[PDB]
């Protein structure tokens, strides 16, 4: 199960 | 840009036996960037129905792909893999050697 | 044995050829189980191992939403990276990410991972504490400061210690007949004369899973590392792997050489020699 991205670079 | 040229191995899934169906593999690895052209050849001509794995990469960020097709080896038919990549000035052809 | 889960993301810009492509693949150990490709006719998370197929529609929808959002996020990250490196909009560039969890033999978390790269070079990595970052350069330090301000590490720690481990354990159980089965190598030595006074001995390992293996040649009981040609472990296409190691030896000295094989499917390491 993948995780969501939290913030851009 | 810092680029890495592909390593290439050409080999069969199972030990080759003439007249017995098998799979011909061309494993390309160690390359960066990811765009790459791979053909499998039978007597110098491109094999039409070739599949490949989904793009992934190693711990050093270099990419790898497996290209493969069903084949029935014989004594006389020659097989090879032909690879093009931005790091190559001409396509690299690696012949299938059943001992490697 | 020990087990791991990893996701691998690749985002590749291609100015003049549409928006950047995003590909994600997921592995348990050396077994791929999902893929997503933004260039597919209908981008969605797709199964790549039989034991994942039983997950219900909520699983497929949740993961597809993640990867569709990530397609957009990594297009933005590629634009940001151009600013951070003073680069033009004309070139093609790649972001990669790899993250996931490792379990020890008792199923306990050993450690988590989350690392990213730009153009094939390390960019930023979550430290083993799951609380701080290592930036590779002054560009990645900008991202580090942004992620510190937003407490990103705390969210990643919560995933890596929680959902990552829970889902890996579930996959290991559902796929136990394959994921928890080691296939030992089938081994043999071949002999290839190279001239009247030397021959190649090649030690083969075939049909093994997982991919980790050690193959070494000794001469008179001393490792021959500098003199051994060792090919990269390679996939057979049936889940298993292959490897060989070769030495060139003086004709008449073949019995002084022994090949040694270590693999988790073997109860004891093997010693082999050429058997004419």
Residue numbers in the entry:
A (entry chain C): 1 to 9
B (entry chain B): 0 to 99
C (entry chain A): 1 to 276
Copy out sentences from the published article reporting this entry, exactly as the authors wrote them.
One such highly networked epitope associated with control is QW9 (QASQEVKNW, HIV-1 p24gag residues 176-184). QW9 can be presented by the disease-protective HLA-B*5701 (hereafter B57), but also by the typically disease-neutral HLA-B*5301 (hereafter B53). Here we examine the CTL response to QW9, a highly networked epitope presented by the disease-protective HLA-B57 and disease-neutral HLA-B53.
The changes are not caused by crystal packing. Figure 3e overlays the structure of QW9_S3T-B53 with that of QW9-B53. The biggest change is QW9 residue K7QW9 flipping from being buried in QW9-B53 to being exposed in QW9_S3T-B53. Since the position of HLA residue Y99B53 is fixed by a hydrogen bond to the amide group of T3QW9_S3T, the distances from the OH group of the Y99B53 sidechain to Cα, Cβ and Cγ atoms of T3QW9_S3T are only 4.1 Å, 4.4 Å and 3.8 Å, respectively. It is thus reasonable to postulate that the bulky HLA residue Y99B53 pushes the sidechain of the bound mutant peptide T3QW9_S3T upward, consequently forcing E5QW9_S3T to rotate away. The electron density map clearly defines the protruding sidechain of K7QW9_S3T. In B53, E5QW9_S3T is tightly sandwiched between R97B53 and N70B53, meanwhile, N70B53 is tightly sandwiched between E5QW9_S3T and I66B53. The N70S mutation in B53 indeed increased the melting temperature (Tm) by 10 °C when bound to QW9_S3T, indicating that N70B53 is a critical destabilizing factor for QW9_S3T presentation by B53.
